[PDB]
Design a binder for this molecule. Structure first.
Ligand SMILES: COc1cccc(-c2ccc3c(CC(=O)O)c(-c4cccc(C(=O)O)c4)oc3c2)c1
Length: 188
């Protein structure tokens, strides 16, 4: 077959029930995730190939960056609660990996302030129990699939993308086949 279990994707031994249709995990400390987001724009290219209105979920992970890595998961929960993901994704990636000016929770907060999020607005969400639940959601999702590495993408909580089975000769070709695989899986 053109698509085969173990080539472009893998099947989860224990399927996860009720998971998001398309769920990808990432870390602002993850170098591959930087390439995925800023150079390849994988998520946006996957979204453009799925049926309009499909649910695309993106969660941060804890297992990179120790203390800061957990602050970034809470900061991503803040971004999700306020709906400012598209405003802080770039500066956070570059703050951590390009300029390396993000070394504390306050430095993370600076990115939101510079992005236009009001100070009181950010601090209220940071300490809100809505955000604490969003943090638990992200952790539960990663735990459900026994996530040990990022970047990663799962489809309907049963199939896991295998980026190792694609050609990296061409930036655009790699993205296209990745997105086509997600489409194929979502139609399974
Ligand atoms: C077209 O030019 C470019 C320009 C910028 C980046 C890339 C590029 C190429 C190859 C990969 C691979 C697979 C591999 O390492 O073989 C991964 C990856 C993804 C998720 C998890 C893991 C893991 O194993 O944890 C690895 O990300 C890649 C990114 C290519």
């Amino acid at each position: 077959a053109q698509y085969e279990d173990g080539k472009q994707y893998t099947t989860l031994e224990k399927p996860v029930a009720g998971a998001p249709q398309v769920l990808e995990f990432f870390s602002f400390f993850c170098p591959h995730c930087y390439q995925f987001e800023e150079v390849l724009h994988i998520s946006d290219n996957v979204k453009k190939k799925l049926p309009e209105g499909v649910k695309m979920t993106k969660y941060h992970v804890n297992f990179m960056g120790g203390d800061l890595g957990k602050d970034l998961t809470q900061a991503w929960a803040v971004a999700m609660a306020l709906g400012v993901e598209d405003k802080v994704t770039v500066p956070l990636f570059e703050g951590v990996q390009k300029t390396q000016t993000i070394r504390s929770a306050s430095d993370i907060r600076d990115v939101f302030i510079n992005a236009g999020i009001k100070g009181e607005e950010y601090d209220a969400a940071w300490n809100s129990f809505v955000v604490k639940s969003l943090v638990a959601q992200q952790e539960k999702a990663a735990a459900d699939v026994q996530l040990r590495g990022v970047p990663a993408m799962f489809v309907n909580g049963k199939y896991q993308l295998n980026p190792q089975g694609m050609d990296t000769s061409n930036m655009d070709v790699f993205v296209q086949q990745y997105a086509d695989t997600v489409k194929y899986l979502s139609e399974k």
